Amino acid sequence: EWEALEKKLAAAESKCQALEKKLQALEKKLEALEHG
Amino acid sequence: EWEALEKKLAAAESKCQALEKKLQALEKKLEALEHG
Amino acid sequence: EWEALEKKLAAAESKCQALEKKLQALEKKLEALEHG
Ligand SMILES: [Hg+2]
Ligand SMILES: [Zn+2]
Ligand SMILES: [Zn+2]
Ligand SMILES: [Zn+2]
């Protein structure tokens, strides 16, 4: 249905933003190893 | 159209879950370098 | 509305593809540390 797709998309957006933060967190740890 | 958007979203969901697994795989390799 | 959801989804797709590239970029740096 229509509303279930609205929510699916909102959930998808929040998952991608959480994965962007995890990526930023990993990049910080990598840069420490690469320059520390 | 409507159905093409249903599928687009399903495809988007599966890509994000695959990227989450790749992220977990990279985090494991990073943690080995950081603590090994 | 309907069109705002069309665009939301397109924006979501492009964010995930940008995060895939960042992931590939990080994986390359990790592999250098792991094998260099
Ligand atoms: Hg994503
Ligand atoms: Zn660096
Ligand atoms: Zn650690
Ligand atoms: Zn390797």
Side-chain angles (χ1 to χ4, degrees):
Chain A
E1 82 208 357
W2 176 246
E3 293 180 37
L5 188 147
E6 253 169 9
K7 307 174 126 40
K8 250 190 180 181
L9 175 61
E13 285 174 314
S14 291
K15 181 175 265 275
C16 209
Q17 215 198 324
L19 288 195
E20 190 175 334
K21 279 168 53 61
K22 279 198 209 78
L23 195 75
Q24 189 199 6
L26 287 180
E27 175 184 3
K28 189 181 184 179
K29 290 156 79 75
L30 200 169
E31 288 297 332
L33 293 177
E34 169 173 303
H35 298 281
Chain B
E1 82 208 357
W2 176 246
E3 293 180 37
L5 188 147
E6 253 169 9
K7 307 174 126 40
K8 250 190 180 181
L9 175 61
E13 285 174 314
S14 291
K15 181 175 265 275
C16 209
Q17 215 198 324
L19 288 195
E20 190 175 334
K21 279 168 53 61
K22 279 198 209 78
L23 195 75
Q24 189 199 6
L26 287 180
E27 175 184 3
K28 189 181 184 179
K29 290 156 79 75
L30 200 169
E31 288 297 332
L33 293 177
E34 169 173 303
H35 298 281
Chain C
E1 82 208 357
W2 176 246
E3 293 180 37
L5 188 147
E6 253 169 9
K7 307 174 126 40
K8 250 190 180 181
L9 175 61
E13 285 174 314
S14 291
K15 181 175 265 275
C16 209
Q17 215 198 324
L19 288 195
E20 190 175 334
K21 279 168 53 61
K22 279 198 209 78
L23 195 75
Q24 189 199 6
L26 287 180
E27 175 184 3
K28 189 181 184 179
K29 290 156 79 75
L30 200 169
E31 288 297 332
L33 293 177
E34 169 173 303
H35 298 281

